[PDB]
Each structure stands twice: as structure tokens, then as C-alpha cells.
Design a protein around this ligand. Sequence first.
Ligand code: B43
Length: 264
Amino acid sequence: YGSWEIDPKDLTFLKELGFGVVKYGKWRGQYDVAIKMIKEGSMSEDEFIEEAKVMMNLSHEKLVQLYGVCTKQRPIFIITEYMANGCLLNYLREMRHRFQTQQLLEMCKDVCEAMEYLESKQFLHRDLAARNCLVNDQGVVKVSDFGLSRYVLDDEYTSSVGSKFPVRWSPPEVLMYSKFSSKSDIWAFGVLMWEIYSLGKMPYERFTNSETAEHIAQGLRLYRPHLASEKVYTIMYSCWHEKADERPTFKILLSNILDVMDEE
Ligand SMILES: Nc1ncnc2c1c(-c1ccc(Oc3ccccc3)cc1)cn2C1CCCC1
């Protein structure tokens, strides 16, 4: 076993949590883990395994921690930090939480910290969205599935023509030219802020993907969620400059979010 490789015999599977299936379990009988099981034919496995070595060296409190992989048998496993409150999107949609806006801004800050870290490592997420963030037992949001889209074999998800592509989280230059950059992550982050302040509404709710792409190409934008103050709206909106070079960095976004927290 290499440093990136976990012995699957050290795993105990306890419950199904919901590419494939994800389970909750224990490592060596004691420590909580999530086990993401990768279905046959779904992934470029050799490429993922090499990238896993890079992903192992990423470490930040607001990034879901990759403990290792199991790849000597199939389906291959991705072993990670267990996030008790599950997917951010589902969490947002649970109206019982009765969120204060302070809580929503903190979720934004959690994600922005992770993204500033990824940016500092020149690591693109490539599919940032509420559905790809997780929430722990303390209500902390962490970024997940970072870079994983690179290894998906289903073409419907691979390009902007595809029926599974994240059109609603994509800047004009991605939709038109497939130009990915730090600034396409920035765009996606703004959409994620919008999802958070909208309590999990689908971006461009009333539009198809086709219509959304048209909307975007015409320079139209999401508008202010009811729960977003003018200051918060200014921050998400800054992520959507037509010109990619005019969009902020995650460092700048983080400073702006901190400022709003201080001003309340
Ligand atoms: N870690 C998790 N803890 C709790 N629930 C989880 C996960 C994960 C999870 C586990 C592993 C995983 O693997 C990676 C993590 C980071 C980077 C790349 C892969 C991604 C998500 C998913 N789920 C749920 C959300 C909706 C239904 C399933």
C-alpha cells in the first residue's frame, strides 16, 4: 500500500448516505469516515489515481479532507472526512433551520476560505456549486469534489453542449469557448452565494439551460435574493463581470465578506 492507499479491510460500513453510492462507516473500528464508491466505467481511473496524490497534499479546515483511496479492487473507494449534515443544497432547503443572515454569510465565508486556499495552490475546482459542498455536525460548510469533473467519462457532463453540464454556474467565456480559469471558479462562487442567500433555489429557476446560456450571452444576470443586503449583493454581483479579468480574486472576496460581517 502506498501513502495514498487505504486498506479496505480497515473499513466498517454502517449506513448508506446516498457516480455511485456514498456510505458512512468507521476506519479501524473507531474513526468516522465517508466512503464514496466509484461505479465501473464512470471514471478515468488511472488519471484520478495520479491526481489523488496531489489531492492528498491539500489541507485546509474548510476543504473536505481526502484520507485515501482504495483501488486494488473495483469499485474504487474514495475515503473522506464524514460530514454529518450532508449536502449544502439539501441543508439550505430545510426550512426548519430558520437561518439568520449571519449564518448564511458564515457559509459564504467558509467556502471562500477554502477557495482562497485552492487558488493559492493554483488548483481549480471546476464545478463549484451548493450541491458540491458539505456540512458537518457543527454547521461548518466545506468544499468537496474539487477537480473531480476532470475524470468523469460521461460526455453529457463534460462539455457545455452536454445535458448534464453546470450551465447555470458557468461564465460567458466557458459557455462560448470552454475557457476555464480562476475566474470561472470566481463566477461559480458568486452563483453559490446566490444559492445560499436564496435558501437553495435553482439559479435561473424559470429557464432551461439553453435559455440560461442565451440570457448570459445577452449580459443578463441573477438578481438580488430577498435575504441579501445591498452589501452582500454587491459581493456576489462582482463575481459576474463580463470581462474575466475584472472579477476579484478569492483573497479580495474574503476581505469583502469579512468587512460585511464587521458592518453586519
Ligand atoms: N463526506 C461525506 N459525508 C457525508 N455525506 C456525504 C459525503 C460525501 C462525499 C464523500 C466523498 C467525496 O469524495 C471527495 C471529496 C473531496 C474531493 C474529491 C472527492 C465526496 C463527497 C457525500 N455525501 C452525501 C451528500 C449527499 C448524498 C451523499
